[PDB]
Amino acid sequence: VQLQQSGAEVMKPGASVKISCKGTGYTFSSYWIEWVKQRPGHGLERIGEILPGSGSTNYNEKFRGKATFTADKSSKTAYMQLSSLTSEDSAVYYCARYLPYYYAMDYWGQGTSVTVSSAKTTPPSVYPLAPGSAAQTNSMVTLGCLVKGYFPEPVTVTWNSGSLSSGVHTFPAVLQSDLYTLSSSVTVPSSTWPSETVTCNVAHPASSTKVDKKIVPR
Amino acid sequence: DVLMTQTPLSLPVSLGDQASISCRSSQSIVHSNGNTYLEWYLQKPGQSPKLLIYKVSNRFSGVPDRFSGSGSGTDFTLKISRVEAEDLGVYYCFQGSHVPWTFGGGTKLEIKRADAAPTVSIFPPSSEQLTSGGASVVCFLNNFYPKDINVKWKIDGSERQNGVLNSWTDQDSKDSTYSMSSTLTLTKDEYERHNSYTCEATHKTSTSPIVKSFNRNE
Ligand SMILES: *[C@@H]1O[C@H](CO)[C@@H](O[C@@H]2O[C@H](CO)[C@@H](O[C@@H]3O[C@H](CO)[C@@H](O)[C@H](O)[C@@H]3O)[C@H](O)[C@H]2NC(C)=O)[C@H](O)[C@H]1NC(C)=O
């Protein structure tokens, strides 16, 4: 048994998207397909369900009109269409297999990520950050490599060939205005910092960008 | 639409300590066949939810016996006897009794330990930031527990609050300590105009805010 979902999607506000969930290894037509929304913040919200065998569908009142379900019996796939996309529709959507009053949602899809925004594929703008001139030097000093002005997610910030696997704190990306920005901090002894060389290996698969820039001491 | 409410929103419990999540229904979710259809799901970070319990008490095939459910009417509870690091995540309710079927709010389970003091730091904008025409003042508050943290920026004695960037990192594993990377962005004309930039840190471990500032004039 396996439920396979479509890939990540990026759409502009006011558009519509069509996600799909393909089920194999069981009687596809005889199990309901539950659609669950998970905003990045928190919470699981059920959009509705469809029984592919018949055409029966149910919708939660919050999503009635926003989402429409359809199923294809020939190819064991179920579709959900979201209309008039907005910012609040950006979330990760799951599909699950359910039989009411019997076997519960034991199998889920991998999750399809949908982002609604008018931005384009902007590359990263990494700004390596060094300690300020007016700052005391201690035994343990934390470095800083800022990345901002990039879209869409994700950007894999790391060190040179995993130079410092431990002591790394990659803070989550956030939308400052319309683009995503993140940060990182790695603890390194002041003794080895002048000698040992490490650089934040910022990456951006969506823009096919791979730029790394280290911080110079003050 | 039956509303399911979970309390507490968060439940810090140390390893080996019994945990107890609770669930409430806007209306009774009993069914005629002699069963009430309540299910418990666990969603670890970056993964789809996994089924744990169904029909209040029945355990899904392959879950440790430490999990157990019980309840009736509009009151149900999930108990974890001996918690373990693999049990971290968000636990969700699900009523499968009345159409449409609704999820619970969720209860983020965390592990508690001895409080750790914050490690505050401030880094001024880098050269490339000046060249690009901006300002990236970043404050790093690493390894602080619990979540009782607040950030306030008082520029040259004036408290700025518009355009504040708030970013928090989830609980770690090696140390299980939170972190914060709230920052602020300023324009060159708005950056050179002022003189003193400060970043306080208010935490339970130290009631007095921690001061970490630099002056533009150097
Ligand atoms: C539709 O009607 C059938 C026939 O009465 C119902 O089947 C019965 O369901 C109950 C509840 O699960 C079964 O009792 C339970 O059986 C399990 C497995 O043996 C056991 O572990 C439990 O402790 C409990 O005894 C009962 O055996 C079963 N009877 C038959 C003949 O299958 C069914 O629940 C009804 N469905 C609905 C939606 O009303």
* Same-domain status, A65 and A131: no
What contacts A26, CB < 8 A, 6 or more positions away? A1, A97
* Same-domain status, B83 and B127: no
Q: What are phi and psi of B205, to 5 degrees?
A: -60, -25
The residue whose two tokens read 């979902």 is A5
Spatial distance between the Cα atoms of A68 and A81, rounded to a whole number of angstroms: 5
SS3 readout for chain B: CCCEEEECCEEECCCCCCEEEEEEECCCCECCCCCECEEEEEECCCCCCEEEEECCCEECCCCCCCEEEEEECCEEEEEECCCCHHHCEEEEEEECCCCCCCECCCEEEECCCCCECCEEEEECCCHHHHHHCCEEEEEEEEEEECCCEEEEEEECCEEECCCCECCEECCCCCCCCEEECCEEEECHHHHHCCCEEECEEEECCEEEEECCEEECCC
* Same-domain status, A168 and A144: yes
* Same-domain status, B26 and B67: yes
HSE, CB side, 13 Å, CA atoms: give it for residue A19. 34
* Same-domain status, A61 and A7: yes
HSE, CB side, 13 Å, CA atoms: give it for residue B48. 21
Spatial distance between the Cα atoms of A130 and A55, rounded to a whole number of angstroms: 61
Q: In terms of residue numbers, what domain contains B94? A: 1-113
Q: In terms of residue numbers, what domain contains A68? A: 1-118
Cross-chain residue pair A58–B99, CB shorter than 8 Å: yes
Q: Would an 8 Å CB–CB cutoff place A101 in contact with chain B? A: yes
- Would you say the CB of residue A101 lies under 6 angstroms from ligand 1? yes
Cited resolution, angstroms: 2.3
Spacing, Cα B34 to ligand 1 middle (Å): 8
* Same-domain status, B73 and B147: no
Q: Say if residues B182 and B164 touch (Cβ distance below 8 Å).
A: yes
Spatial distance between the Cα atoms of B67 and B38, rounded to a whole number of angstroms: 14
Interior angle at CA B43, CA B39 and CA B46, nearest 5: 155
Six token digits for residue B77: 């509870």
Cross-chain residue pair A132–B123, CB shorter than 8 Å: yes
Six token digits for residue B112: 């508690």
Cross-chain residue pair B167–A172, CB shorter than 8 Å: yes
Cross-chain residue pair A104–B119, CB shorter than 8 Å: no
Q: Say if residues A147 and A155 touch (Cβ distance below 8 Å).
A: yes
Amino acid letter, residue B96: G
Atom of ligand 1 nearest to the CA of A100: 38
Atom of ligand 1 nearest to the CA of A101: 38
Q: Where a domain ends, among A67, A100, A118?
A: A118
Nearest to A46 by CA among A55, A37, A57: A37
Amino acid letter, residue B207: T
HSE, CB side, 13 Å, CA atoms: give it for residue A214. 12
* Same-domain status, B71 and B119: no
Six token digits for residue A80: 């959900």
Six token digits for residue B42: 């666990």
* Same-domain status, A13 and A106: yes
* Same-domain status, B15 and B49: yes
What contacts A31, CB < 8 A, 6 or more positions away? A23, A51, A52, A97, A98, A99
Number of structural domains (chain A) is: 2
Q: Say if residues B170 and B90 touch (Cβ distance below 8 Å).
A: no
Residue A64: strand pairing partners: A67
Q: Where a domain ends, among A98, A118, A138?
A: A118
Spacing, Cα B197 to ligand 1 middle (Å): 69
Amino acid letter, residue A82: L
CATH number, domain with residue B24: 2.60.40.10
Q: Where a domain ends, among B54, B78, B113?
A: B113
Using what technique was this structure determined? cryo-EM
Q: Say if residues A186 and A143 touch (Cβ distance below 8 Å).
A: yes
Number of structural domains (chain B) is: 2
| Residue A3, helix vs strand vs coil | strand
